Amino acid sequence: MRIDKLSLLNFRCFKQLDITFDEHITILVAPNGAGKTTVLDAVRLALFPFIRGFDASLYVKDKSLAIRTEDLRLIYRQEALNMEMSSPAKITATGEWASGKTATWMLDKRGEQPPHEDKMAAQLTRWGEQLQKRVREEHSLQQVELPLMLYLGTARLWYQEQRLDNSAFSRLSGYDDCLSATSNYKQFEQWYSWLWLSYREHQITQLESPSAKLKEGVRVQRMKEAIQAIQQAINCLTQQVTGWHDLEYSASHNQQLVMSHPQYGKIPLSQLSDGLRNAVAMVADIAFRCVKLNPHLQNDAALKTQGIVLIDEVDMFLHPAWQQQIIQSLRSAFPQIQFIVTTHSPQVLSTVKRESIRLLEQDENGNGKALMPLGATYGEPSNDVLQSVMGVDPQPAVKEKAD
Amino acid sequence: MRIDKLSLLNFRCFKQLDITFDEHITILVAPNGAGKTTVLDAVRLALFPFIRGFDASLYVKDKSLAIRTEDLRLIYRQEALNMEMSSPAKITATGEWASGKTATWMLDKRGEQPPHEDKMAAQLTRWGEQLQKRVREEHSLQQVELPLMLYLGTARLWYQERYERLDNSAFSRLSGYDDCLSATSNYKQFEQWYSWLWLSYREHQITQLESPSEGVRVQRMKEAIQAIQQAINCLTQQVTGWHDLEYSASHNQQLVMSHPQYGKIPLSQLSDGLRNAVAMVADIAFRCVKLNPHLQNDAALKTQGIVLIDEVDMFLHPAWQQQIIQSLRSAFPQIQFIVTTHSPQVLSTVKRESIRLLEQDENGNGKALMPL
Amino acid sequence: MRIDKLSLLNFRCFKQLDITFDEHITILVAPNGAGKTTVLDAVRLALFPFIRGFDASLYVKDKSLAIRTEDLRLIYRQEALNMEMSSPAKITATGEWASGKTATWMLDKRGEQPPHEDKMAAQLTRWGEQLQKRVREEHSLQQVELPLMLYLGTARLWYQERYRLDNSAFSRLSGYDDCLSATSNYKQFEQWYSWLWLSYREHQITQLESPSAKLKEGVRVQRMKEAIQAIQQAINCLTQQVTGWHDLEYSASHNQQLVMSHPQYGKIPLSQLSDGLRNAVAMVADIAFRCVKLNPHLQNDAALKTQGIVLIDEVDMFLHPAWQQQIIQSLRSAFPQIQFIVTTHSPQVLSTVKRESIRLLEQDENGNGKALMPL
Amino acid sequence: MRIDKLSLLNFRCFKQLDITFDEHITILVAPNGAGKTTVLDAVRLALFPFIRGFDASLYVKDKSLAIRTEDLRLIYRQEALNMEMSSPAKITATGEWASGKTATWMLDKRGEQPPHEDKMAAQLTRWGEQLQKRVREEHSLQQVELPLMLYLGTARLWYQRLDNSAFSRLSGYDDCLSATSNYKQFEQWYSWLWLSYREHQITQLESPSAKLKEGVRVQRMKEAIQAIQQAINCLTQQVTGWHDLEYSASHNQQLVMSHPQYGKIPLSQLSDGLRNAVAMVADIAFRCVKLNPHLQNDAALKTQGIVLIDEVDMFLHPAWQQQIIQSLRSAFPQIQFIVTTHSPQVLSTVKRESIRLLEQDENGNGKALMPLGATYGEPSNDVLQSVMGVDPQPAV
Amino acid sequence: MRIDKLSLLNFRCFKQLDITFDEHITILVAPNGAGKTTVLDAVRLALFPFIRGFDASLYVKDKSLAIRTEDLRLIYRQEALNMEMSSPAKITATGEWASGKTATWMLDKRGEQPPHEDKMAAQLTRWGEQLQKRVREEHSLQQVELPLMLYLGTARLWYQEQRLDNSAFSRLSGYDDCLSATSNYKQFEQWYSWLWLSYREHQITQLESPSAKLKEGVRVQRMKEAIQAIQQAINCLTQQVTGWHDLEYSASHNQQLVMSHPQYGKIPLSQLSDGLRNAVAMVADIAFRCVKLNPHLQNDAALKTQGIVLIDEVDMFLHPAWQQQIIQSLRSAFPQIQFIVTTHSPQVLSTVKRESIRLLEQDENGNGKALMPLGATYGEPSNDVLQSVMGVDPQPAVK
């Protein structure tokens, strides 16, 4: 899918808001308040009707992907004892799906009544069901490429029957917990370790009985090509800056995943710096979902998949020299995916053009605005974008500054 | 939101009944088993649609707020020693909703099918929804006035050892319709709200004493407390001497009252009559204050609506019974009261145009007539 | 287990009070705030040790069954606008426990220390324990008679929409289950009475189908029948004459409910009847089924011959003035051997009672109380 | 469903075995480690496919309901001192699925290759499908009779409607091949049944004029109680004087039995062994009643099927071991019982044709033969010595 | 410890009962109703005060180990509407806590009040505390052997940091769940597998640096002695009848325990007969507790330990040829243990003398008796015992 515009009425901290998104990358910036998380949560709420069109979502019954009563706006008046609600709360999303079907759907809630969806939201659910039914077919010969929907929150580090080849399952399992706020690192490492050990054992039984190479040669090829695809994506981000590359599984290291550096050798990933582990988590989260969704590519599943990814605090635990490389690395690893990210770093903001930047501001009554920066930011020194866009002086207000 | 006339057909003990109500006070007088609770149940069933037009009604668990199969009249065939169920049960109400808006609505049930309402009954829900919509509007010029709606049955009583932070919905005007027609006790709701009032007021006092450096919120809180306290005084002070209900931290964070000869004592340690009368009056008063903030000091004296009281004279001694009706008329001069009793002392100095004596026939045809 | 005299010192509103009780019925008459509930609470506290001498008392959760710091009288000093607490609070009771056994016992509390009792209270507990031991004996020749002990406060009321057997519920001593607590005891009676009726109907069905085993099985049927009719007559002594309703019974046709009948009206469940009828029926049944359970060997004079003390607060709730003129005599007729102590403020309840049964409660400006017979 | 012959080869401990069963009752007799649970598990696997398509048993997928790699026989050489994993595992079953409809099916497994059944077993599966669809109808003059499949193992001893619907009818196949029968569940559901029946009896006492109000769900209850009482009477009424197990509110809210001289006695004062036997018989009768409503009280006396019992004499006094087999025969005269035992008091009351002595040579050439002596009416010592070759004199 | 007599008053199904126990083996027989489980439960309740003085007690809150209200007698009379209890319920035990000192302690409960113990029960707890504190001090030259207390119920098969050498723990862990009614085979298998893997890994480590042989030779020896004793005990029961022996742990069989037969090779224990599994469970349950309680015996912990073992349905899942060998096998593997067992098998009853047999009979009012068989039972044909002690004719009542 793709989202081109969003409109909010009486949502958490916005009386009214209209925001448009860039096709490839758009960065949200907010000097103060909680506007960015509000926008991300609204977008993540607007995408749930599609995921509800898959019975795999039966595994998720979270009471957080629908509008709640506490999401409505409360107005406190200093001179009144009573405090009322603002009703209704509306989320209106304009976008494109089917690669040619433009649409505009809406969700709303009235006070304490259950939330109500309009017709086009049900149509989005139905379009989600069409893909499910067309994928479950066995006689089908035409191939189907599913879209990707992922959410990466700020709590993606706290909480820290496998099947790869095509099937009814193993393709709808790429939508499991795809919009949750918890960490999803265990279900990646288990899958990766199972894949590695099963691939090695398949090769073992292959050279043990070469006569049975009728179909045990293509299977090994697929299990190898998936690993290649994942490793290339991870390297694209880690290698050129830190030197570590080729995430691998080594039974020797107490059944634990490890990486390798040209000079420091092989070390477990669980004992590297915070930034590298965070980056690996993000890129793996995207990549293994991409591969599990489109096995029929098996070498470019990370280079031709389409969808939307939401990232809060993209450059967390990264030093400035790494903050000038994250965005382009994400673009290069996933060239046909929409990214919506939040950031604070002036280093990041100097690596994108002013058309990919939204600055959020709120009025005294709650009216919101999402504007573009007047000045230029592409290829500029950090101190220039620090004061032109964020309004922060580069020379600290030390005692001697007054003179 | 006056109600003027009521009609019943095949309801519990009445084959048919017609009753007319007085604008301010009407008293139903009859012995046990004559149908005094039946009339009040019919009235609250007729009034519930308006409340159904609100969000506070989503938490109503009272199963007696809808017509039930047990409400259909049963006839005893003595020859065959049999009971036969007559159908349908019907409740018709006539009245006025707002200024210059007269209406007639109807409720019905047949056999064991779910109950049914007519066309004009849904417009009552629509009016409730429109009022709720108007209250929730930012930057409005016109004021909205809300009518009071309350049912005080025998479930209100405070017996021995009953011992019956605020949610964000408890700060709304419409929280005045929370369990307003249910068969329940509503004392703890009031106690929490009143304690919050007193603690905020004391906070403002402490700040304006310590470091003078806002001034309208204190006035609002003070006026609210004054309204509620005067309402309770109107009933308790003259007969018993206990006047001023307050929140006290010295007494282990409790509600207390004062006496001139006796000192300051918690409300839970006072007698049955005191506790029940105070709960009864407070139940009306704090809702009056919450529903219409803009009056600010005449909230109890100027609010309109309907209050139903079953057995208004429970736990009150004969000298107290001779004052209850006038005290209620003095505290709330603009409310329509419908009350039931069987005690003659409650009627000592009441006009004959406010009394309805209830009677039936051998076939169950009822009458509700003024005394001669 | 008669009680004859009561004394109070520094107890709630009374600085000191002496009151004497009549052998059968005593009525306390006064307005609100005069101390009618205080006297009954003091009697509860004086009687609770005997019940403490039983196992059923192990499940008592009522915190008002012991003297509390809130029961100590407070004096208001108007000059200083102060409240000062008097100490100690004291309760003295005189009476007779068994035939030819007169006693005087005392309860005390000072300040905020735990309450304390004297020796005779412990002897009362010991008597209770010995009675329990005698009841739990196999192959005994002597009979044991148990006294009734019950408190019916305002917590008994049956308001709108207010409303398998354990092996201990089949004991005689289960007649002392929550007998002095501030609670409602309707469900106990309902469950046990339903069990009675179902067993009786089982026996009827069996004797209709296979008339071959009514020998030493018919005696049990006789006992059940006699118990049912005792309870039914006790309830009839109060409702039939004024209201016309009678013969409470279990009905499976009416969705397995307790039901009453009327000559002009039909047969209707008890939960659909009026307030006065429901409350009067609950009040009388509460005494009747305990009378039946405590003394199985009387078999149909259980209510007519049992002895004990019953305390009733506001005996005339929900009853109209023509019903109030009959309550006292109805209670005396149903239970001729029980000592009743009741409170009221309604004159109609005193229409035809002797003046030697009335105690008017008065106080002076300093808190010294009197409970005097009317002139 | 009836079986007439079973053949095995390369199964757990049998290199090859051929056993022919009896029409009504057959008892497998052998000492420990002689292939009795083996034969019962083989028969249990053989009859599974008929259950796989009943819309309630197509949910349960137990590893014990299909052949496993551990069932493949292992040979010992004694020279290399290693265990040879033989293959393949084979089961071939011969029986009848309906009136005069002979059949023969087979199942196999090789190494780690998942076992693959023949299409002749899918014939049985679709036969079960046809039966379930035929019963699902609500209008037909013909009456559909279902068979009872039941397996009670050595783990049998631990852990609300009789409508003629397609749900209650198919409740008879609930865990039928992994069934358990203890006393607590039995008393629970029997008490519920009796309470529901007494409600209607008392209602008819109070208001005789309303006889016709009910009677669809009531006759079901009455006749089910009659059938269960019949079966339990067949169990207990001869050895002791008890009969007519019943629920009594008067007698302490308990299940009781009646004795012409001793009166009523509660069921909870009996030994824990006889209580479980009563529970077993009652559970079989209740399943029979639920399966075939259209008999309503002879459902137990006219249902057909196969019941497998391992250690039929478990936790039974030597007095009760002499009447269990005849009681089971008298309570269900149209069922095929296959039971395992090693007691000599169990075999002292049956005829030789039912007895099956199991043997196995040094390789696995299993035999299942008949005794050369006699057992019916014989004393315990003669049965011991002749059948089991165990001297009645202890070697002190 | 030892128990010589027991007396019950107003317990579950006995108005009163007196029963004496043989020094080595005593068998309870009851033809009708309950009563054997009642006696076993009473004995198991009379021993809890000892285990209470070891910190492995009602902290875990096994409410079954104290007298409960449902354990009191309850008399139903048909001609009375009421039903009272019989109070109090008393259990009186006479025994010997150690060689030389006899004792008589009592437990009782009155109606619904909490159960009450006399002085000697507290003294028994104090003796347990004495043994605990003496065990916890290693600053001593002389050793003391702990006593064994075990209970094996009928539900012992329903749902079938390791430290061996001496320590503060590893000796008080032999009292964990020693009187519970659940199955305790999982912990045994875990401990046994840990012991075997440690033994093999450490004898492999010996090959690496034999310099520490003097310390790694004794330690390994320990793990090689315990095993031996355990195995021997098992082989005393499951070999002369079936031929299997030498219970072992082998990772090559998917890391599960296996046993060996001369002709059938090595097979996992999970796929053997029911009788073999039951017997192995019982004997292992006794043996590993014996070894964990007295390591210093170090080769005969299963041959010199003392204590009491209670077994309900000892001969369950055993064929008659094996029912003539169980009792002597138990006596041979554990020659200094007291055994109290229940059976209803004539084969078992013919292998013991009439002095070791108690027949339980109950009166109409609940009075109980535990008598001895009048006739002889030692070395007699099965039927003689069948109709002499149990009153069952050997000729079935066929048509």
Ligand SMILES: Nc1ncnc2c1ncn2[C@@H]1O[C@H](COP(=O)(O)OP(=O)(O)OP(=O)(O)O)[C@@H](O)[C@H]1O
């Ligand atoms: N379904 C029914 N059919 C016929 N009569 C009924 C039915 N349900 C109730 N009744 C009778 O109608 C009477 C109505 O009495 P109700 O309690 O309403 O009046 P009241 O006694 O004056 O009031 P209260 O004492 O509650 O203040 C009930 O007492 C009962 O006798």
Ligand SMILES: Nc1ncnc2c1ncn2[C@@H]1O[C@H](COP(=O)(O)OP(=O)(O)OP(=O)(O)O)[C@@H](O)[C@H]1O
């Ligand atoms: N600790 C105390 N010290 C002094 N006075 C007290 C204290 N506690 C309560 N009181 C006063 O004593 C009065 C006793 O009145 P009480 O409730 O006992 O009698 P009543 O009104 O006749 O009874 P009821 O209405 O409950 O039938 C209470 O109302 C209260 O005013």
Ligand SMILES: Nc1ncnc2c1ncn2[C@@H]1O[C@H](COP(=O)(O)OP(=O)(O)OP(=O)(O)O)[C@@H](O)[C@H]1O
């Ligand atoms: N895969 C196998 N290969 C070889 N022998 C096996 C295999 N599985 C089990 N066995 C042997 O088969 C025998 C199992 O006997 P079985 O399970 O039939 O018990 P049973 O004692 O005859 O019956 P019951 O359980 O009724 O007492 C044992 O000897 C066991 O060693």
